[PDB]
Ligand binder design. Sequence first.
Ligand SMILES: Nc1ncnc2c1ncn2[C@@H]1O[C@H](COP(=O)(O)OP(=O)(O)OP(=O)(O)O)[C@@H](O)[C@H]1O
Ligand SMILES: Nc1ncnc2c1ncn2[C@@H]1O[C@H](COP(=O)(O)OP(=O)(O)OP(=O)(O)O)[C@@H](O)[C@H]1O
Ligand SMILES: Nc1ncnc2c1ncn2[C@@H]1O[C@H](COP(=O)(O)OP(=O)(O)OP(=O)(O)O)[C@@H](O)[C@H]1O
Lengths: 237, 384, 266, 249, 48, 210, 244
Amino acid sequence: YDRALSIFSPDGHIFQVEYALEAVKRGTCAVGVKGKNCVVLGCERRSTLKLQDTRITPSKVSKIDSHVVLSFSGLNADSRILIEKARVEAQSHRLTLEDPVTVEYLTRYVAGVQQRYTQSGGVRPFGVSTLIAGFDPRDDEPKLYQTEPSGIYSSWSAQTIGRNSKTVREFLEKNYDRKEPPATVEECVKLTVRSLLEVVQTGAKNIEITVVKPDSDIVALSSEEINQYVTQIEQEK
Amino acid sequence: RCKLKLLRMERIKDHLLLEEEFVSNSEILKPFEKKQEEEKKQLEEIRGNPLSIGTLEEIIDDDHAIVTSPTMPDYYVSILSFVDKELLEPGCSVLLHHKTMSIVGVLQDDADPMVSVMKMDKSPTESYSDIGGLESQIQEIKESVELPLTHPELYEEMGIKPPKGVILYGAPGTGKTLLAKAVANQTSATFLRIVGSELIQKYLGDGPRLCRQIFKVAGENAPSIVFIDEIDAIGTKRYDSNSGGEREIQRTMLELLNQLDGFDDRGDVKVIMATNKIETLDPALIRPGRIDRKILFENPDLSTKKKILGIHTSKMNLSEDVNLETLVTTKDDLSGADIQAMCTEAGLLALRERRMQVTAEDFKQAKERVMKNKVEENLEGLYL
Amino acid sequence: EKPDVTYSDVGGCKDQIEKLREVVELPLLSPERFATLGIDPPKGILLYGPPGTGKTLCARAVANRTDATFIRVIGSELVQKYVGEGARMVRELFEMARTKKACIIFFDEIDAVGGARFDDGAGGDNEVQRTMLELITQLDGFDPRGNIKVMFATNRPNTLDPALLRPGRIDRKVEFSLPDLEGRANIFRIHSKSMSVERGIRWELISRLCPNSTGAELRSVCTEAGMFAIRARRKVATEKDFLKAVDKVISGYKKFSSTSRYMQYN
Amino acid sequence: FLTRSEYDRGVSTFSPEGRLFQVEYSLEAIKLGSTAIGIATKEGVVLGVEKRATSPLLESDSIEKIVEIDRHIGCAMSGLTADARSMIEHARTAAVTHNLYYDEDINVESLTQSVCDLALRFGEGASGEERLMSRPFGVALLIAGHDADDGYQLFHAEPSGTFYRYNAKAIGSGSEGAQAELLNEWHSSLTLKEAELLVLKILKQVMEEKLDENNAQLSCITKQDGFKIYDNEKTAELIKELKEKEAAE
Amino acid sequence: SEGTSADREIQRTLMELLTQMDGFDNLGQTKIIMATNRPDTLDPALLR
Amino acid sequence: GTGKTLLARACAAQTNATFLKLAAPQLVQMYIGEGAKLVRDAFALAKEKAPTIIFIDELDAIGTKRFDSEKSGDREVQRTMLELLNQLDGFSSDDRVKVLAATNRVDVLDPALLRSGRLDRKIEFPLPSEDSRAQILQIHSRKMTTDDDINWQELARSTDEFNGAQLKAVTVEAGMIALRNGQSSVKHEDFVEGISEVQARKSKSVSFYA
Amino acid sequence: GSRRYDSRTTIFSPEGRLYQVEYALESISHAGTAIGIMASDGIVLAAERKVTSTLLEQDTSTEKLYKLNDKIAVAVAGLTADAEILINTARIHAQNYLKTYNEDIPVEILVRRLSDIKQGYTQHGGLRPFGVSFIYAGYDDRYGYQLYTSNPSGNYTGWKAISVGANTSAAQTLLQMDYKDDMKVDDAIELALKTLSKTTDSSALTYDRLEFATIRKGANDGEVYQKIFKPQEIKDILVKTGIT
Ligand SMILES: Nc1ncnc2c1ncn2[C@@H]1O[C@H](COP(=O)(O)OP(=O)(O)OP(=O)(O)O)[C@@H](O)[C@H]1O
Ligand SMILES: Nc1ncnc2c1ncn2[C@@H]1O[C@H](COP(=O)(O)OP(=O)(O)OP(=O)(O)O)[C@@H](O)[C@H]1O
Ligand SMILES: Nc1ncnc2c1ncn2[C@@H]1O[C@H](COP(=O)(O)OP(=O)(O)OP(=O)(O)O)[C@@H](O)[C@H]1O
């Protein structure tokens, strides 16, 4: 097989990149907001279905190195091929050039990965959009990037992708400030919970929060924790 | 006392009016007795009986005409006695004299079984705010449909031509259908409504005569508002392929461009089109100035759906139990036809009980049936 | 009967309408100059180009000026239920126009009925292509057109007959164009001179803001600005409302695909 | 959408046009390009790009369409910028290859010719080169540069595989509006700060926000200082001194 | 007869031939010689 | 463009033979047994007024290649094709009745018109030749007034593959240009600029590498 | 030629969605039901055969049930041919893991590997999917008993109670009402049986139409006894629960 699954369109596009963006629209919603000394990725999980084992099943936030997290929206099945490439590149960087990867280098790699499956024959793009966030090593600047299935990469101050992202994005213009992040880690978490409660709704059990602090500390806050943070927002509102 | 007050005035007046006209029938003929009475005698003798129906093909300006009768024989008749030649002109049905055929007058005209589908017999009993909410994308349909009929004054100040046309587009169930019938109640001018599935036919040539007609009637009985409901239906519906197909679709489209506009200089025919296949139309259709302000509708937001759900639950029996706001929580960027089907289904739960009450339990149960429809022609579960 | 539209009101202020005035308009006024020349005077013209360029608007302008008979045809009006019925229609229409003295037949929207001839071997296109042929056989004839000036209005040159587009019976053929950066300024002055606006404005400004565009947009820049006029409750139109309106039309054009699209196949 | 296209089933198939349709479509993706303006003089070449703000929450000072090939050649991308992620690496490789084999600064024209030979390699397998692409690139470059053999040169590289040497060219969406002004205002008797200010004149007209250094970026290639990306503080000064002289009218 | 009315005019006249050719109407010393320029135009009840 | 219809009228009138004017689309009628009856009466007339030449202009309207029709009103059209092939057979009183036929294309004809007995001699009208073009130009230009500095070879070199309708359309177009300068005599520099203004094609299109 | 007749079935729809995946999911509710119910002491896997005839031999048949290794067995529902292949791919993967680390595979790892295999066929190469759904019962020490379903797209989620195949919606409703977090294996066996008695696509529900298998902690010394039952041991525990 060497026949195209990418047929050029007279519109100034490729159909399959437009189809791949819709597929991303229909995916679960991710928020990213970076503090002054943290990153915070909040993601919706549909836990609406009952008798779900949640212990054994991976969160929709995957660590790809000891200080770079990747969250995603769109085709869940497809995403895992990207996560396996990216973990592999992370070691290769240590092998041949030494030190851990930079968030930028890894983001670029991801960018070239999704890009490839557009331009090559025999393959269709991936309809998966990533939020790549993290720290560079020896550094303490949070750097929050977004890559999208067009194979276009971006830096962002805060971003959201997924379902009904627009509703959260308008909220984020108005409650997060370009000039000032919220400075405590805790307030940043609650700003993102407060944002999540627009579309997600339906109790606080469909909210999951991963917080990363520099020096390679990725911890994910449990349901119990969230429960306390949500109730606060609830009372104050 | 609040119904009665209305009734007491209006009934007594319809009873008097009726009675008035009985005594009055006789009274019509009294101010004359030879001043008009005599005139009537003169016209009648001329006419005699039967007055033979003809069809007038064409006039000649020497006081004659060529009729072709539906009984076969053509006749070179004379336009004589009690007739204006300005009420004559192709298409007329005429009264002929049963000895020598002279056109004594024109009184007969005969309606089509296609102008019967077009013309409506109702005035809409529902009015506006029966899907209300998204009530700022409705002043793009009442500042260009309602208002230049209501006020010439505003568009005289600014001068120039006043508005012309709208294309309504968006998700299905987001009110498009009711929008059109809600402006026709307020304006009260001739409301034509045609389905697009009737513009697609299984016979050629008659396709174009139908589409050419709608605006010709429309300009005649001006002002008119022509609702073309569903112009998304022109490329998805088609019968056979040998009197259907490309050819028949292309021709009806071509026809419709002359009508709107075109060269006709017909009557007022504001246009309202509902669609959601807007890219199966021409660039000379979605051309500006046959569309002016165009209206996009998307799915309502969370606080909009609270406007929608309180319209619908006013007509229903209520309790202190009922809580609207948690029904809102569950639905997330869904149509107000979805929300209209839960309230219609909630009384289906009341009907099923045979209990006259409607409770919070009845609204939540039918919300589960409404969400069953959405995700079960789905079979992915969680997005694969 | 000839609808009233001034000759200075036109769908496009160009030298293109002047070329019309040498083929159609002038040998009706003066066939004296074309006798002195001795040339056969040109009769036919093709009017073509993108929608919204007021294709049919300059031919309403020219219908005001010439005062000849206008007999207008719709191409989708030429197709009837049974085949060869429409054969009757066209033949008869042309012979009525020969009897008529100083007349013009304006072929509008003859994209169906006027299209290219080709074979299908099982089609239902053949029955339509009978009437397509009936249009050729009348134009050359076995006699000439004795003062019948012939316009054909086509959206599309993309498909046409090559014997309804032979160059001796449609003579000079005029491409109608998109207004220039000067041409939009002219159009939009015909349109805002007609509107009450607060003096000291630029009609040049509004053209720049616009990309290469139609004047049918410039007729709707005013009218949508007029609706932003009534909402502010102004008798007058100012600069501020004109800005909102330029944004409104352009955003819509992109969203659909109003320009550089002509659809159909025949 | 759905505009008549008779043929377009092959990715190279003809067409009563006399030329391929797919190549034509590639050029119709550069009219959706964010506008890149470039004025070439005999004293230097200025590459200006509108960074393009999409959101107030997007950091628009971190994203840029100035891309360095090497110190003596700069390049600007407009169009579909994912396609330029693959080619710009290739071009940087290329330059380096020349410095390995010949220990010399590569000609601007030569370098331009190389990504064109890359640009033409769409297909299902044919000719001397093995096809590895299958759809044509939908991106155009403005390779500027300086060599000490033919001076300042500026090239417009096409997805077609064609290169035309320009003396100034703007591409992108506002291309049509730009090239009217270039025709009258350009000449060969310009000086560097009168050109620089010309980039910001024309940038002003195709601006969809307003002009400030939070959505516009300048960059140069100078003979004795090389390719230099102008920072925002420096960029600001010039934008204000335009605004001083436009208020002298 | 998904076409025009012409094609059920064909049909009325064709049915008349079949009752003649074989029916309670019988032939005879009457012979059919049928000359055609292509025989796969025909209805197969005229190939019979 | 080659003046198919023009030639046949001119030559049939010069030599005298009863010239019947029939346009093939007129045989198509939505009537059968009356539309089909113009054909019948067109032989009956013609055998009285014999020797006569029956000129059918176009022959695609009744000259359908189709005779395998599927689901269409093309079996109505072909009954005037079939009735034509019957009376173009001898049962005598047709030995002196002829046919001229002009048609735009000859790839659309029925296999029962490939055959001799119908139209036996098959004449092609070719695109003009070098000598032929020069002649054509002089025949139109005889009608109008020219100056005496014209060279008919110059104009004919500079037009290559121009059909007779385009060449009629240069000659006319020259006196448009004349009128606009404002003359009363038509220069030899005008016919050259009518080459560009009116052809058949507007330029060589946009080329970006052709 | 070839490009002309190319199906192109691995392109996105306008919805962003993959028609052939859905078509695969449509066709597995035409195959029999396989259910997993996780008890706290073990895992019951209960499958209803999609064939039955009195002339059938359905006694050596293990036509839904397969051992991948002695600690992780599967229930198969769908097109059996495609499924057989993956089953020996899986064995090859288990033994590989065992070669290199000299330690049995955790359930987490083998379910991720099969899933990536599926992912490849829908992602490119112009192929049609492998239309199979596996219910993995397995024991590992690291996370205990773990129960899993995977679908032809190649995506997995853990479950405490699941149903696949025929009447998925139906079986799910039932499971939710009659589940309790911690059960004995017997109570589970009972429940496994009971759900299939209310969902059976023929009125009758019998032992010879049940394949039924467990993994039990009734092996002493913290080991797990994989048991695929004989149909005559199924017959007794079906009379126990009083169905027959
Ligand atoms: N805002 C609302 N308030 C009350 N009823 C509403 C509202 N929106 C829609 N509905 C109701 O939903 C039903 C269908 O809506 P309608 O036909 O008016 O619009 P539409 O968007 O074209 O959808 P569809 O054409 O599929 O019915 C009607 O009974 C209508 O009144
Ligand atoms: N070039 C222009 N100058 C002035 N007015 C223009 C111009 N172009 C279009 N218009 C406006 O557009 C209106 C309608 O155009 P018209 O119907 O006459 O055009 P057209 O080019 O034949 O297109 P179509 O036939 O497809 O409708 C005109 O009445 C006029 O107000
Ligand atoms: N040999 C010629 N001499 C002079 N002018 C010529 C000559 N032949 C043709 N022309 C010019 O070309 C015109 C077109 O000719 P005519 O209509 O007879 O051609 P045809 O090939 O049957 O085309 P159509 O039937 O499509 O109109 C003539 O009216 C005449 O002006």
